[PDB]
Amino acid sequence: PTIPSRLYSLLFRRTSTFALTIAVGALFFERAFDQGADAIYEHINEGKLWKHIKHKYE
Amino acid sequence: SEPEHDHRKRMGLKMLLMMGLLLPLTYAMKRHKWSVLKSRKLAYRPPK
Amino acid sequence: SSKWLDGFRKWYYNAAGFNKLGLMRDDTLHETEDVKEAIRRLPEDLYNDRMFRIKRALDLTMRHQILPKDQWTKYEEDKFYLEPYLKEVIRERKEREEWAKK
Amino acid sequence: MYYKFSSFTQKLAGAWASEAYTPQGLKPVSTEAPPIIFATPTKLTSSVTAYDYSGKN
Amino acid sequence: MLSRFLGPRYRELARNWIPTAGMWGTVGAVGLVWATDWRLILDWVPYINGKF
Amino acid sequence: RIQEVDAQMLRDICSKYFYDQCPAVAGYGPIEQLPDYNRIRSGMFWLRF
Amino acid sequence: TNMRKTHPLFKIINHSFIDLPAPSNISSWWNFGSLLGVCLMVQIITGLFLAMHYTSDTMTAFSSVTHICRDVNYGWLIRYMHANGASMFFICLFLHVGRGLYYGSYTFMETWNIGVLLLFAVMATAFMGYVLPWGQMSFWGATVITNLLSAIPYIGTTLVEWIWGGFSVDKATLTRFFAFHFILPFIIAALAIVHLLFLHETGSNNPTGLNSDADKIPFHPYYTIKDILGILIMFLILMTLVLFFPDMLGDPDNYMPANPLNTPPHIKPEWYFLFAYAILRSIPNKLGGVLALILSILILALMPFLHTSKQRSLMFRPITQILYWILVANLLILTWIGGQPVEHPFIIIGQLASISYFSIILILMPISGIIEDKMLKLY
Amino acid sequence: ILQASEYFETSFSISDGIYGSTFFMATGFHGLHVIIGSTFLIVCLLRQLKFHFTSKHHFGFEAAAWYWHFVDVVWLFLYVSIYWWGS
Ligand SMILES: CCCCCCCCCCCCCCCCCC(=O)OC[C@H](COP(=O)(O)OCCN)OC(=O)CCCCCCCCCCCCCCCCC
Ligand code: HEM
Ligand code: HEM
């Protein structure tokens, strides 16, 4: 009834459920990783990219 | 000369973060599937 | 030859480094037809000892380890077990070659 | 003659008299016990899995 | 000429392999909508609707 | 107790005790065609379930 | 019953990659071989996506490459990974040959000879691919090295007129170089199949050089995941070399259009040819320089008959280890000298470097082998 | 250390009104108490590296965990009362 036993049992034990876990995690990882890397890139280049100066020239 | 410069650097940042995630995990898989062999002990039984 | 050649032989035996894998000298010889025939002519005890030492060395070189220093093969205790068999095989091959010459 | 405990199911199965009631053979003298050598000096401990620590106590 | 599999045992095998084949089909559909970035299903999901 | 056994609980019990489990392998004889522990362990589950 | 051992197509894959016995102690260097195959596929795949937009014409080759970089979606990515993948291909190739030399892998003579055929083919493929973008350096490097290939009396001038398809390098040379550059990686792939086939009759070598039949493991899952990890490390190095330093290994003079009347102050090939270039100009005779380049690349073929020790690997030969590392150092010096202009003191350094290179491979290593044989009390 | 950083980079001092006085005084005693807790954890860590805590009689880390949970619930009260609500 412990959490790692049930996490193995209903997610990792079956191979089709393993693949479903991998696919859903891939989609959510794509969204979160794209947001994180885009935010890091726009912070490192604060005021330099076009979207930071796009509002001045409407 | 390089209109792709900023997009290249963004893709490189994503590459660096993804590789820094992926390398210890793949190394861990190698260490698992090879740690079945690297802890192996051999013995010898000569009959004399 | 008296003073340092034996000392240089001991130092070179330490420096070459097959003693710290537990190997003897004749285990390190690369196989030819002559060496394979000499190995085939070995008795069962020396053959089994050789093959265990070889796979122990392969185990040690897998993990990038060496034997402890007390288990290093000593220079004086290193026996040349194979080379009479190898010399006999080389001699009979030379006899066959010189007969094929004439 | 009749029953010998065997057969991997832990059962008193049926077996011949020469092995059920004479389990020790007719060989006269035990010959040797060849010892086991290892590659590295291993700590082959039967009881309590050698020692458990992480430093000097 | 597929009359060799008309019996209760193959029906038993079939009802054993309904959920695994259905879950593999679910994996295939989710992977297809994930790889193609298909707009029919990806607009029905909360968190992935961020770039639209 | 034998009459209680049907197919569903039998394959549930067999999946509980066999599926995705690490075996103990002992061998004696000419056993180099006997595979390593990784292939024997990988054979204890199906990729299709 | 099972398809892995009875199906005639899966039997080949099982015999070559799944139940293949491999030595249990091979280091990371062996991964380089599989990396080479991966690079080949990468190059081929990226090459195909350069071929969907490249126009082999002297008016519209440079312009087509700029259109690939500036207007094709992610075309800059594909072009620069093709270039840096050629560089990574040569890095992995050099370390593959160095592994072959150090651990005595040239005793597989058929595998070694199919290897040096593969090396010749990939050098010619990289040459014609570098001619393909039709910049200043492409045109002038092609003209220089083909004109010195013309040095053979009574034969070389007809051969260079036949190779050029005209009086000098022109549109016919560019188009036939495009056809040859496209088609040579498939002969390379078939020769790699023959390379692997000639290897698998005897099995791989191990760093100790001993008979590994006492302890061998299947290729799956061990070396499968080991080569996967090597592929990931290689892709780190390659994508760092594309996404961060896309023209550190390149040459800026290739970014002007090919002006046939603009001779550059320096003319160089790419770096992976440069050592042979420094063996080329180390002799002040054109026949001598070209033939010395041929011997400097075919001394690898001569190598299996220059083995004198009763051992195989250099793991238990310290003097020959020292001579090998002096050889690698000399090769590095030759690369630097071939990068350098033909002035003082580079001419004497290059001459001594080539002399020491041929002396170390030809003379000094069998002498060191027989010295170590006498030193180990067996001769 | 990053509480010292927000002490360095705040817009007001302890003499800057009753809000500054209350906030800095409460956070100052919280910082003092978490320094005491960190020192107590350092002491029990150095005791455990010398093999002192057994499997049952390990009251030093029990007191450390109780003081640390106290510091945690007090910081939750400062987060609600001073930071989130009322500001
Ligand atoms: C007798 C030596 C005793 C050494 C003792 C060292 C300290 C021992 C106690 C501490 C332990 C240190 C680590 C031990 C390492 C292994 C043992 C060892 O020291 O080996 C010495 C090593 C190999 O030994 P060996 O092969 O016998 O040496 C022959 C010398 N040529 O040999 C060496 O290290 C010497 C290597 C010399 C290499 C010189 C190369 C000069 C030429 C380079 C040219 C490059 C190209 C230049 C360009 C050419 C064109 C212009
Ligand atoms: C076209 C590039 C090449 C490819 C794709 C290639 C491919 C391979 C592959 C897949 C292997 C087996 C894996 C391994 O053991 O590393 C291998 C091994 C080998 N290759 Fe190559 N190779 C190439 C170039 C060469 C060259 C130029 C040589 C000769 C100098 C060579 C000689 C060898 C040898 C001797 C082995 C045996 C390894 C051993 O047992 O030690 N290869 N190659
Ligand atoms: C069949 C596979 C291949 C095809 C179709 C192909 C095609 C091309 C094309 C069209 C170009 C010119 C486009 C450009 O320069 O960006 C090119 C350039 C090049 N190719 Fe290939 N190629 C292939 C394989 C290879 C291989 C295996 C190598 C490595 C030996 C290689 C090395 C190069 C190099 C070095 C360049 C020049 C890059 C530069 O512009 O600096 N190619 N290739």
Alpha helices in E1-52 (DSSP H): 8-36, 39-42
* CB pairs < 8 Å spanning B and C: 12
Cα–ligand 2 centroid distance for D50 (angstroms)? 46
Instruction: List chain E residues with CB under 8 Å of A24.
Output: 30
- Taking the C-alpha atoms of residue C51 and residue G213, their distance in angstroms, rounded to an integer, is 9
- Taking the C-alpha atoms of residue A15 and residue E21, their distance in angstroms, rounded to an integer, is 12
Burial G173-182 (b: 16+ CB within 10 A, else e): bbeebbeebb
- Taking the C-alpha atoms of residue C92 and residue G332, their distance in angstroms, rounded to an integer, is 47
- Taking the C-alpha atoms of residue H10 and residue G339, their distance in angstroms, rounded to an integer, is 58
- What tokens were used for G5? 């051992």
- Per the structure, the complete domain to which residue G72 belongs is given by 1-379
Burial label, G86 (beta-carbon count in 10 A; 0-12, 13-18, 19+): buried
Taking the Cβ of residue E43 and every Cβ of chain F, the question of whether any pair is shorter than 8 Å is answered with no
- What tokens were used for H74? 């007090």
Segments making up each domain of chain A, as ranges: 1-58
- What tokens were used for C30? 């690369």
Cβ-contact C66, G208 below 8 angstroms: no
Cβ-contact A52, A46 below 8 angstroms: yes
The DSSP annotation for chain D comes to --EEEETTTTEEEE--HHHHS--S-S--S----PPPEESS-----SSTTS---SS--
* Phi, psi angle pair for D3, to nearest 5°: -135, 135
Cβ-contact C62, G25 below 8 angstroms: yes
| Residue (of G196, G245, G179) closest to G47 by Cα position | G179
CB contact under 8 A, F19 and A16: no
Look up residue C78 and give its DSSP letter: -
Taking the Cβ of residue F18 and every Cβ of chain A, the question of whether any pair is shorter than 8 Å is answered with no
Cα–ligand 2 centroid distance for G96 (angstroms)? 6
> Within 10 Å of residue H21's Cβ, how many Cβ atoms?
14
- Binding residues of G, as ranges, are 82, 96, 181, 195, 200
Residue for token digits 């947001």? A35
Dihedral sign for Cα atoms in the order C28, C30, C35, C41: positive
Q: Given the CA of residue G191, which atom of ligand 2 is nearest to it? A: 1
* Number of domains chain B contains: 1
- Taking the C-alpha atoms of residue B20 and residue B7, their distance in angstroms, rounded to an integer, is 20
- CA distances for F1 relative to A20, A31, B3, E51, F4, angstroms: 38, 54, 78, 60, 5
- CA distances for G302 relative to G289, G308, G317, angstroms: 19, 13, 21
Task: Cis check for the bond before C68: say yes or no (omega within 30 of 0).
Answer: no
| Residue (of G2, G88, G107, G75) closest to G42 by Cα position | G88
Tell which F residues from 26 to 45 touch A, by Cβ distance under 8 Å. Answer: 45
- Taking the C-alpha atoms of residue E25 and residue G235, their distance in angstroms, rounded to an integer, is 33
Q: Taking chain H, what is the end-to-end CA distance rounded to the nearest angstrom?
A: 24
Instruction: List chain G residues with CB under 8 Å of F35.
Output: 218
Taking the Cβ of residue F36 and every Cβ of chain B, the question of whether any pair is shorter than 8 Å is answered with yes
CA angle H24, H26, H29 (to 5 degrees): 100
State if residue G272 touches ligand 3 by the CB under 6 angstroms criterion.
no
- Taking the C-alpha atoms of residue G273 and residue G123, their distance in angstroms, rounded to an integer, is 8
Cβ-contact G267, G144 below 8 angstroms: yes
Helix, coil or strand: residue G23: strand
Q: Residue B44 forms beta bridges with which residues?
A: D37
Cβ-contact H78, H30 below 8 angstroms: yes
- Residue G319: how many CA atoms within 13 Å on its side-chain side? 17
Q: Given the CA of residue G353, which atom of ligand 1 is nearest to it? A: 50
- Taking the C-alpha atoms of residue C50 and residue C26, their distance in angstroms, rounded to an integer, is 9
CB contact under 8 A, E12 and F48: no
- Per the structure, the complete domain to which residue C5 belongs is given by 1-102
- Taking the C-alpha atoms of residue C63 and residue G27, their distance in angstroms, rounded to an integer, is 10
- Taking the C-alpha atoms of residue F23 and residue C48, their distance in angstroms, rounded to an integer, is 31
> Within 10 Å of residue A19's Cβ, how many Cβ atoms?
18
B25 Cα to chain C: minimum distance (Å): 21
Helix, coil or strand: residue G315: coil
- CA distances for G110 relative to G33, G114, G117, G199, angstroms: 16, 6, 11, 8
- Binding residues of G for a ubiquinone, as ranges, are 200
Alpha helices in C1-102 (DSSP H): 5-16, 33-40, 44-62, 83-101
- Taking the C-alpha atoms of residue G234 and residue G41, their distance in angstroms, rounded to an integer, is 14
Task: Cis check for the bond before G185: say yes or no (omega within 30 of 0).
Answer: no
Cβ-contact D26, B35 below 8 angstroms: no
* Number of domains chain G contains: 1
Q: Which ligand is nearest to the CA of G328?
A: 1
- Residues of G annotated as catalytic are 200, 204, 226-227, 270
- Binding residues of G for heme b, as ranges, are 82, 96, 181, 195
- Taking the C-alpha atoms of residue G1 and residue F33, their distance in angstroms, rounded to an integer, is 18
Quote helix, strand, coil % in chain A, to nearest 5. Answer: 80, 0, 20
Q: Given the CA of residue G101, which atom of ligand 2 is nearest to it? A: 30
B38 Cα to chain C: minimum distance (Å): 6
Instruction: List chain E residues with CB under 8 Å of F48.
Output: 20, 24
Query: What's the gap between Cα H8 and its chain centre?
Result: 18
Look up residue C85 and give its DSSP letter: H
Cα diameter, chain G:
73
CB contact under 8 A, C12 and G375: yes
- What tokens were used for A4? 């790692």
Look up residue G218 and give its DSSP letter: E
- What tokens were used for D16? 């011949």
State if residue G133 touches ligand 3 by the CB under 6 angstroms criterion.
yes
| Residue (of G77, G73, G53, G57) closest to G65 by Cα position | G53
F47 Cα to chain A: minimum distance (Å): 6
| Residue (of G286, G290, G277, G296) closest to G357 by Cα position | G296
Residue for token digits 């040819």? G273
| Residue (of A21, G221, G13) closest to F38 by Cα position | G221
Cβ-contact G248, G241 below 8 angstroms: yes
CB contact under 8 A, G218 and F36: yes
- Taking the C-alpha atoms of residue B7 and residue A49, their distance in angstroms, rounded to an integer, is 11
* CB pairs < 8 Å spanning D and H: 3
- What tokens were used for G226? 């080991």
- What tokens were used for G27? 């280091």
Instruction: List chain F residues with CB under 8 Å of E20.
Output: 48-49
Alpha helices in chain F (DSSP H): 7-17, 37-42
Cβ-contact G342, G270 below 8 angstroms: no
State if residue G332 touches ligand 1 by the CB under 6 angstroms criterion.
no
Q: Which ligand is nearest to the CA of G66?
A: 3
> Within 10 Å of residue C74's Cβ, how many Cβ atoms?
10
Q: Residue G217 forms beta bridges with which residues?
A: G22
- Taking the C-alpha atoms of residue G274 and residue G282, their distance in angstroms, rounded to an integer, is 12
Dihedral sign for Cα atoms in the order G305, G307, G310, G316: negative
> Within 10 Å of residue F3's Cβ, how many Cβ atoms?
5
